[PDB]
UniProtKB/Swiss-Prot annotation, chains A, B:
Name of protein: Triosephosphate isomerase
Organism: Gallus gallus (Chicken)
Binding site for substrate: N10, K12
Pfam family, one: TIM
Gene label: TPI1
Positions of the catalytic residues: H94 (electrophile), E164 (proton acceptor)
GO cellular component: cytosol
């Protein structure tokens, strides 16, 4: 019945071996709630190193992958490679991929289908831009993004949806608890009606966008917020407090 | 005064620890000519592994990087990370990045300037499509691509230019020796008039696109071909024959 609370840290394009080493030591030595599923998204060049150093209860995620196992795609990595080094998750459809690197809903869907077929878990990101929210079409936008993912998902047990409003990512402008709840509730209703009641009730829908130690507890108390995707604060000691937001 | 012959292997999106370990074991034990500079371009997720396992005389390259040292670029790596794991080269502007992933000349120029500022070597790729070649504008296209790079190079000592006709990549349609030589001497001539005589005589211009152990010797004996960028054949034992193309 109860969805396990989920906190992912997305380190983005940050770190070197020595500074990530220090972060990993802090996380390994910290008291992390046993009721939180924790996943760290490391830059591709440090995925191996991170999986080797992190305690086994912390999952490792890649920050992107491509949509076939192998081939003539200079610069890309595939789900087979991610699994080879022992990572169990991949983040797909991140806002930075969609808006800086031009990844379309079609390509993201194809990535989701492929990562799931290869046995990875997927954190699939959706979210509206500021102009979209101000025009009052948030629902339309997130439903459309969600549909593009859902059309490529057979088994939902390994999917986490991350609602991250683009205007809240890296800016410090966090969504209010009520803004986040309204969207998660609607998304969960979308799952009920377009997939099944059982998938709606078991799928984690996490919030991301300027989550800090200072604001996480009120966010986490909302009934449809199942955890967080944390960027900037995942590089700080306060990541520990976010993992422990329900305690 | 003579330009050191240069052979790069671009593994593209291929391999796992087992298969790459075997390849590396073969290269470390091979009878490799002392007069050839060799660089292996690994998938980002294996860069660390490859640098640890490959003999020090063999250089390691990233297959791509981004244009700043750090930040909110989920899925990207920077020159500082590449340096951190001990790789000394990056491949930029590869055909697959241009045509599959939409990287523009402007972006590639910025990546080049940044990689060089951080102290990496760059293997910068240019080349025309079939329809451009048949329309008689090969020269125009490669000069425009070369200028976007060159306007961003302060120090040519760590630059290698790679001419790869798009139509020869992965197709088995290798350029004839006279096709490659035509373009390479025109490029060297462009360098002489737009940069300097010293830069024209010391910059390696390497050919890529369906280079094999069977066709490499005739290409290598051309006066302005200084080596190769090898895709498909870099995953095979004949890669050693290519390295030894002048013997």
């Amino acid at each position: 019945a109860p969805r396990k609370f989920f906190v992912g840290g997305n380190w983005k394009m940050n770190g070197d071996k020595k500074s990530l080493g220090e972060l990993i030591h802090t996380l390994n030595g910290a008291k992390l709630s046993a009721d939180t599923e924790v996943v760290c998204g490391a830059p591709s060049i440090y995925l191996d190193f991170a999986r080797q150093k992190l305690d086994a209860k912390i999952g490792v995620a890649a920050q992107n992958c491509y949509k076939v196992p192998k081939g003539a795609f200079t610069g890309e990595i595939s789900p087979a490679m991610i699994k080879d080094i022992g990572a169990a998750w991949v983040i797909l459809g991140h806002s930075e991929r969609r808006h800086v690197f031009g990844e379309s809903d079609e390509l993201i869907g194809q990535k989701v289908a492929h990562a799931l077929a290869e046995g990875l878990g997927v954190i699939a990101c959706i979210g509206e831009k500021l102009d979209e929210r101000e025009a009052g079409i948030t629902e339309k936008v997130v439903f459309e993004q969600t549909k593009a993912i859902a059309d490529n998902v057979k088994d939902w047990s390994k999917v986490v949806l991350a609602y991250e409003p683009v205007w809240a990512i890296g800016t410090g402008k966090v969504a209010t608890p009520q803004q986040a709840q309204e969207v998660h509730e609607k998304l969960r209703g979308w799952l009920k009606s377009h997939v099944s009641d059982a998938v709606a009730q078991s799928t984690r829908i996490i919030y991301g966008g300027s989550v800090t130690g200072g604001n996480c507890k009120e966010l986490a108390s909302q009934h449809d917020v199942d955890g967080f995707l944390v960027g900037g604060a995942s590089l700080k000691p306060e990541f520990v407090d976010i993992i422990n937001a329900k305690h």
